[PDB]
Amino acid sequence: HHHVINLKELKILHTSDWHLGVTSWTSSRPVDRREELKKALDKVVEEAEKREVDLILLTGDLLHSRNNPSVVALHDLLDYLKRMMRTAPVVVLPGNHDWKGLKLFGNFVTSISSDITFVMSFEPVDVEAKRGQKVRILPFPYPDESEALRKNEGDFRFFLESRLNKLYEEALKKEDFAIFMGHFTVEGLAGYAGIEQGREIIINRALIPSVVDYAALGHIHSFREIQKQPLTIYPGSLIRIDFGEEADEKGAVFVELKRGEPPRYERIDASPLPLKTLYYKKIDTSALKSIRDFCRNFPGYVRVVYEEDSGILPDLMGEIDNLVKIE
Amino acid sequence: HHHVINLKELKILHTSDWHLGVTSWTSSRPVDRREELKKALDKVVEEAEKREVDLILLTGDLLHSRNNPSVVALHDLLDYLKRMMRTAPVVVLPGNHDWKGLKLFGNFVTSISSDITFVMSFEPVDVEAKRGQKVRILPFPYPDESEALRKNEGDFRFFLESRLNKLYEEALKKEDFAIFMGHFTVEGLAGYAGIEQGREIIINRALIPSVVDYAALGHIHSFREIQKQPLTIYPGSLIRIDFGEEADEKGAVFVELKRGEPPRYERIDASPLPLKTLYYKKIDTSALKSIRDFCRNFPGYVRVVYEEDSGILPDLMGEIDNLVKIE
Ligand SMILES: COc1cccc(/C=C2\SC(=S)NC2=O)c1
Numbered sequence: 025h026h027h028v029i030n031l032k033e034l035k036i037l038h039t040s041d042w043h044l045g046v047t048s049w050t051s052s053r054p055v056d057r058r059e060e061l062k063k064a065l066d067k068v069v070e071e072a073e074k075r076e077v078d079l080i081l082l083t084g085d086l087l088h089s090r091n092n093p094s095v096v097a098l099h100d101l102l103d104y105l106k107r108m109m110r111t112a113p114v115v116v117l118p119g120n121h122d123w124k125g126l127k128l129f130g131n132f133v134t135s136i137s138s139d140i141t142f143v144m145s146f147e148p149v150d151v152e153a154k155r156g157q158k159v160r161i162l163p164f165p166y167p168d169e170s171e172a173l174r175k176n177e178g179d180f181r182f183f184l185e186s187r188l189n190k191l192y193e194e195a196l197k198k199e200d201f202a203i204f205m206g207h208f209t210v211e212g213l214a215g216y217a218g219i220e221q222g223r224e225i226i227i228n229r230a231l232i233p234s235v236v237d238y239a240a241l242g243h244i245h246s247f248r249e250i251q252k253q254p255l256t257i258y259p260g261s262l263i264r265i266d267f268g269e270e271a272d273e274k275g276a277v278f279v280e281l282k283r284g285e286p287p288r289y290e291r292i293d294a295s296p297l298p299l300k301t302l303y304y305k306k307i308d309t310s311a312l313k314s315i316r317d318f319c320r321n322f323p324g325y326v327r328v329v330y331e332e333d334s335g336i337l338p339d340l341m342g343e344i345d346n347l348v349k350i351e
Numbered sequence: 352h353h354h355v356i357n358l359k360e361l362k363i364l365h366t367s368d369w370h371l372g373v374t375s376w377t378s379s380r381p382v383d384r385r386e387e388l389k390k391a392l393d394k395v396v397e398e399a400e401k402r403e404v405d406l407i408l409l410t411g412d413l414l415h416s417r418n419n420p421s422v423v424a425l426h427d428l429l430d431y432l433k434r435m436m437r438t439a440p441v442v443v444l445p446g447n448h449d450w451k452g453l454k455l456f457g458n459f460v461t462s463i464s465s466d467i468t469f470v471m472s473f474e475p476v477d478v479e480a481k482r483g484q485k486v487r488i489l490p491f492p493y494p495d496e497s498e499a500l501r502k503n504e505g506d507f508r509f510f511l512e513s514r515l516n517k518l519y520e521e522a523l524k525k526e527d528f529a530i531f532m533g534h535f536t537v538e539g540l541a542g543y544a545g546i547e548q549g550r551e552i553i554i555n556r557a558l559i560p561s562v563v564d565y566a567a568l569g570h571i572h573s574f575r576e577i578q579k580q581p582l583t584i585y586p587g588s589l590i591r592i593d594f595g596e597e598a599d600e601k602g603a604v605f606v607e608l609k610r611g612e613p614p615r616y617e618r619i620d621a622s623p624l625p626l627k628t629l630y631y632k633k634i635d636t637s638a639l640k641s642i643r644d645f646c647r648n649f650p651g652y653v654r655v656v657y658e659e660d661s662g663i664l665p666d667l668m669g670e671i672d673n674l675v676k677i678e
């Protein structure tokens with residue numbers, strides 16, 4: 025960190041939901057997403073160095089595997105943390121990972137390095153940005169399955185709301201900037217896919233402390249500007265992980281804060297490979313030519329959906345390399 | 352770090368074989384060794400601060416469980432690494448741990464901090480001590496099951512000797528100090544117990560590069576001065592882990608190196624709880640009173656061995672709190 029005299033500006037890189045280590049459609053045609061994903065991450069890291077960001081915010085789901093992440097996935101994560109730390113201080117709000125050692129590793133790494141901070145509790149942390157700016161981090165991670173295992177919905181809502189009220193109180197005692205970091209699902213998300221075999225946490229967007237200068241959220245795979253006061257953004261994932269994300273905007277966001285003035289932000293589009301679902305009434309020869317000609321010019325991955333039985337289908341996937349799913 | 356110019360001294364703390372997380376005699380009377388072990392570790396840390404050591408060497412088997420160490424064990428390990436890093440730079444040569452993430456964690460931690468170094472290959476690493484001394488580390492870790500799985504005794508030994516000769520060559524290109532770090536069993540160890548359910552690596556003490564200023568070894572639970580030139584020491588464990596270690600010396604060592612002068616070292620005794628095996632031919636009333644009177648005054652843990660059947664034994668362990676095993 026430089027010790028440039030405390031300024032009124034704060035340039036922020038905010039990215040999340042990397043899902044490192046993911047292989048899509050493993051039970052039809054496994055496609056390792058690593059090359060496309062690293063291509064998107066390199067784009068984000070390079071853009072941050074170009075824009076000379078002061079702070080880097082990561083808000084979880086950086087690894088696809090919640091249980092046993094591959095050595096390759098863990099290597100890429102620590103690799104990209106290292107590259108970002110060389111650019112600006114990094115604050116990491118991890119997702120709902122399964123092994124408890126992560127909290128000990130995170131606290132240990134936070135203790136031995138000034139360039140990275142792991143926030144894994146509801147307790148706020150003050151950090152210093154690249155140009156000396158003092159930033160109070162208001163963290164709101166995934167609570168617990170155990171407290172959720174209470175099964176009483178009423179008290180669990182009250183637990184979360186009391187944690188939010190405290191973060192509001194501590195945001196008032198800020199110095200230069202206060203930044204909220206949360207890993208949850210905003211209530212009533214326009215076009216929310218749904219639960220992917222798991223219990224989710226639903227928070228009303230109005231409960232986010234209005235006095236924070238920026239609300240950095242993760243867990244949602246599409247870019248979403250939730251609200252303007254306080255500015256609340258899901259950056260989205262960097263790749264289209266599965267079909268259903270065909271219309272999502274993918275990338276990161278660059279946020280600039282000035283005291284007393286409204287915040288400005290630009291999207292950093294990852295330019296991800298596209299997805300396409302092909303719907304056919306029946307798989308006939310006229311529909312077969314449509315399938316082949318489409319994939320020959322389509323730079324992404326294709327799914328074919330049909331309900332009318334069309335006999336034993338010809339080896340479409342053994343023939344078409346970017347056709348990954350037929351259902 | 353201080354940068355003392357033309358410094359000919361290097362004060363070293365060398366400890367190893369902590370076995371954090373161990374619970375002894377789990378199949379007779381489980382005794383959690385954590386309190387005694389942290390008591391010994393605190394003693395070592397305090398002495399290092401008193402002597403103001405320049406470098407701290409750890410040579411493996413710091414955790415008892417090679418597979419899934421408890422969260423408590425990992426927390427204690429990271430806790431004591433943190434305390435030692437505040438005193439002096441730390442070089443860590445880990446033992447044969449099982450999960451592959453350790454090398455990624457180690458390299459990541461090494462990259463972000465100048466006060467800790469993980470050496471997990473045969474590749475030498477240069478480090479800076481507390482007062483600016485340049486130290487070349489010659490690491491010789493436990494290889495792998497795979498290269499040992501060659502099963503050809505001739506080639507495997509030649510591989511190990513090739514690595515040792517290479518470490519000798521790079522030790523010649525030293526700057527101020529060169530330190531050998533190895534995790535293996537020296538050949539022909541006077542009173543060596545044997546293999547504790549595992550294939551071990553046997554190295555002749557003469558193969559250690561004679562040009563190093565100090566040879567820091569781990570894996571053996573007893574203090575052992577292997578040779579004088581180069582000075583080669585097993586520090587031993589900090590507690591008496593199981594019966595058979597009753598007569599071992601336990602603790603760490605404080606080593607001082609001076610250019611052109613012979614090295615000096617002192618033992619730092621851990622003052623561990625003693626162990627005692629009571630051997631009786633037959634468990635009679637005279638042997639029963641002997642067992643009770645002995646343990647009442649013995650500050651450590653006691654094992655009772657007898658071969659002649661003596662009927663249903665009275666609840667000796669239900670009476671004697673430090674009687675942990677009857678076999
Ligand atoms: C699982 O070992 C590590 C080590 C370092 C960082 C992370 C971060 C994670 S994992 C997840 S899900 N979201 C995150 O931000 C995980």
Ligand SMILES: COc1cccc(/C=C2\SC(=S)NC2=O)c1
Nearest residue numbers: 411412413414444445446447448
């Ligand atoms: C298993 O996670 C960690 C994390 C940091 C250090 C170690 C060291 C070890 S493990 C072993 S056996 N010997 C050692 O020195 C292990």
